[PDB]
Amino acid sequence: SMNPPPPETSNPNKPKRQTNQLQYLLRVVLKTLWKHQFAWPFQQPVDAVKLNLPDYYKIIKTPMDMGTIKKRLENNYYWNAQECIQDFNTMFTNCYIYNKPGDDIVLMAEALEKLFLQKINELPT
Amino acid sequence: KSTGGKAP
């Protein structure tokens, strides 16, 4: 019942660029979701030790959280916006796989996703 | 905030 190592947020070997779209994902998408009232269950990796969740990582093998994504975006870890969008989708999907549909945390992730989906529809040239 | 949002 240890935690795995968090996901990579930094690799100096990967190449790096700034796009319109990556800047929108940090400053519009991430910022909006980050400041949401329901954001806090997702701002860090699920710590199964401190939270007593011994099944979490027997069930979730591709973990993701908005803290990781935030760091990835600050570190130019992403080259394509789609890599970033996929991490958000993995984070939502994980919440739907682990929690039962009717748990509070699923309703919370659904509100974030709706906001998330509204926001990426506004992603630029 | 005890079980970081999860239902026991």
Author numbering:
A (entry chain A): 42 to 166
B (entry chain C): 9 to 16
From the paper:
BETs, like all of the 42 human BRD-containing proteins, contain additional interaction domains that recruit other proteins to the acetylated protein target, forming complex assemblies and contributing to processes such as chromatin remodeling and transcription. Direct targeting of BET-BRDs by small-molecule inhibitors such as the high-affinity and pan-BET specificity thienodiazepine (+)-JQ1 (hereafter referred to as JQ1) enables their displacement from Kac. Multiple decreased interactors harbor sequences that can directly associate with BET-BRDs in canonical or new BRD-mediated structural binding modes, and we propose that the tandem BRDs present in each BET protein may be capable of simultaneously recruiting both a histone and a second interactor.
To understand the mode of engagement of a single BET BRD toward adjacent Kac marks separated by longer linkers, we crystallized BRD4/BD1 with a histone H3 peptide carrying K9ac and K14ac (Kac-X4-Kac motif) identified in our SPOT data. This resulted in an inverted peptide orientation compared to Kac-XX-Kac peptides. While K14ac superimposed well with K5ac from a H4 K5ac/K8ac peptide, the longer backbone linking it to K9ac superimposed with K8ac, sterically filling the remaining volume of the BRD cavity, and resulting in a small helical turn. Indeed, while both BRD4 BRDs bind in solution to H3 K9ac/K14ac, phosphorylation of S10 had no effect on BD1 binding but abolished binding to BD2, and phosphorylation of T11 abolished binding to both BRD4 BRDs. Phosphorylation on the longer linker on histone H3 (Kac-X4-Kac; the second Kac being outside of the BRD) affects BET binding, potentially linking cellular signaling events to epigenetic circuits.
